[PDB]
Design a protein around this ligand. Structure first.
Ligand SMILES: CC(C)c1cc(Oc2c(Br)cc(NC(=O)CC(=O)O)cc2Br)ccc1O
Ligand SMILES: CC(C)c1cc(Oc2c(Br)cc(NC(=O)CC(=O)O)cc2Br)ccc1O
Lengths: 297, 297
């Protein structure tokens, strides 16, 4: 069974990595690029970019552990633990050559440690729409002069006693529509049909729980990254962020400058958090062009 | 029926104020002291203090509009709008003398405008455990290195789509217990019976909504207060705050120093946010002593 429609000419399959069955969608030929989704979504956020990249690359888009059709992690949900699964998965498909990495939202949290620990394995890097977990996250406001803060959910999801699962169970579809639209500028792209697809996936009880465990592990990830960040990234890096409602604006590039020696950043006007769907044309173009500076076919 | 047991020597009663039926509990003899509760609670949080104060003062403890047994406001939930109801209620019982005001939590938000605009009506002021709404609240962090913030609910409650009512309905007791305990040092004072009573009251659909409408009006309250604060408070003021887990610590007095000419403050070690219940004896002592410096029975 498939939760989301696979693009024509791609395959949906699984690889067991360290005892965990990871779902991925793969297509194309050439050097490998791995696309890693974030919270509220699955590999499917990349389904418009995938066919375009597959003209020049082998493209793989996994479901994060516990989300989509991937089994929960057996170790834990901190960035360093999850990154092991992702690094090993990618290296199964590209054992002898570096691969490219594109990550959105908590995809960043779940890949940063494997990038810094295996720099030679990463040719080029694109990060969009989430802070790397570090002390900067403790400075985000709980409440703003415009109202509902964009990261209040960090505390909601991290709260003990399964506060978030308990309140959200049975109302997953309602909650996700609010969360997604509240973080968007171009809300019109989030049709009821599309929201139904994403909600059905994260409503699986293990997936709802997994979602929140990433936040319960956030402070551990921050502690992990305080050590890891002693070495700056050396590979070409690009950041993207939305400049509209819900977007991170200038924060993305500014933080990345502290992490990377070679970084270019873009803020996309009139686009919020959900770049691949809110602003498919300019986002896809930026990603394709950036990755095409390296060898492809 | 009554939602909470009325102390001997007191009466549960109602008054119409600008077309809104307000509930209160009243007893005692002497000059008037009005005690105003906050979020998650009702007049009943004052039930231990009331008998002691009633030896020296006439004591009135209203339910905030929409909460407890009080009708919702017909104007709105902003601080300036709600304060009109509370000011006029107090003046119905103390038309010829100033009265004292003690407020906890959002009782502060709902009284500050009438205090600054009618200073001749306020003999002495006691504020505990909430910021006066101003730009300071925009600095509180969304997330902490120890986990959930004490104020992420500002955004949860202010959010549109009736997010809070929709998620909390059917789980009102569960949520309130979590909220109370996360802001408490001394959780033992919150018996199953006490939590049941508070949960049942705010679970009334108009009360659950009313609760959150206070937060949906918070930015408006901040804008209102930016103008009102041009005039400093001149009456003798005392602040109280908890020094333990869940408490506001030095913030209460330090903020008040910017608003009031004559202020003294105390921080109570070993006490959290819910001062009248967690630390009834020393809080009661401090309030009774401070108010008893003025004229009484
Ligand atoms: C990942 C996702 C949910 C998301 C998080 C966001 O957090 C931020 C917030 Br709130 C506020 C700021 N600006 C500050 O000045 C805060 C500070 O550092 O003091 C910066 C950021 Br970054 C914003 C958008 C967004 O889509
Ligand atoms: C009323 C209630 C819900 C509540 C609100 C609270 O908010 C906060 C407050 Br106040 C002050 C700070 N920070 C400082 O004092 C540091 C400084 O400003 O120097 C941080 C926070 Br977070 C805390 C406890 C509490 O129980």
């Amino acid at each position: 069974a498939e939760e989301f429609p696979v693009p024509n000419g791609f395959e949906s399959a699984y690889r067991e990595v360290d005892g965990v069955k990871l779902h991925y969608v793969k297509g194309g030929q050439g050097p490998l690029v791995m696309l890693v989704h974030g919270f509220g979504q699955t590999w499917y956020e990349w389904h418009q970019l995938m066919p375009e990249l597959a003209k020049r690359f082998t493209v793989i888009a996994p479901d994060l552990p516990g989300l989509g059709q991937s089994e929960p992690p057996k170790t834990g949900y901190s960035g360093e633990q999850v990154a092991v699964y992702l690094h090993k998965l990618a290296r199964q498909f590209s054992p002898d050559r570096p691969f490219d990495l594109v990550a959105h939202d908590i995809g960043i949290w779940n890949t940063y440690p494997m990038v810094v620990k295996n720099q030679a394995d990463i040719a080029r890097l694109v990060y969009m729409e989430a802070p790397i977990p570090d002390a900067r996250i403790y400075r985000f406001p709980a409440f703003t002069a415009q109202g509902e803060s964009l990261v209040w959910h960090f505390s909601f999801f991290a709260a003990d006693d399964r506060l978030a699962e308990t309140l959200i169970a049975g109302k997953e579809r309602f909650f996700l529509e609010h969360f997604i639209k509240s973080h968007a500028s171009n809300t019109e792209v989030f049709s009821e049909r599309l929201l139904d697809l994403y909600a059905r996936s994260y409503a699986k009880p293990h997936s709802l729980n997994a979602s929140f465990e990433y936040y319960r592990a956030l402070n551990e990830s921050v502690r992990q990254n305080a050590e890891l960040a002693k070495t700056r990234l050396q590979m070409p890096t690009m950041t993207l962020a939305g400049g509209g409602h819900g977007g991170m604006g200038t924060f993305q590039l500014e933080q990345m400058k502290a992490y990377a020696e070679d970084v270019e950043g873009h803020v996309l006007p009139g686009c919020g958090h959900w770049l691949p769907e809110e602003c498919a044309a300019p986002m896809n173009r930026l990603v394709i062009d950036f990755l095409s500076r390296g060898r492809h076919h």
